[PDB]
Structure 1
């Protein structure tokens, strides 16, 4: 799952299996922001059955 933590500022990283630890906080913040944004929905009432 490394590719998630190298998405923000690892433009200098060469290897595909590596990531820079110093941007871990920035990557985590971006991940959390996207997590919140993806969940902005209103629940819908569909229907039931006994």
Structure 2
């Protein structure tokens, strides 16, 4: 069945899933730049772009 899955394989699958969840997130957070807020919504904070 295409709509179905075998339960005894659940853990195996979930595990591998988490493994990719990690692999796919292995990056360094890069810094971009800002601009001061020209409105009064915030007290002149620096919003990242």
Report which of the two has the higher share of strand. Answer: 2
Q: Whose Rg is larger?
A: 2
TM-score by length of 1: 0.71
Alignment gaps of 5+ in structure 2:
37-49
The structure with more helix, counted as a fraction of residues: 1
Q: Which runs of 5+ in 1 are unaligned?
A: 1-14
Give the TM-score of the pair, scaled to structure 2: 0.72
Aligned CA RMSD, in angstroms, stands at: 0.3
Which of structures 1 and 2 has the larger relative contact order (alpha carbons within 8 angstroms, sep 6+)? 1
Q: Structure 1 segments of 4 or more deviating over 4 A?
A: none
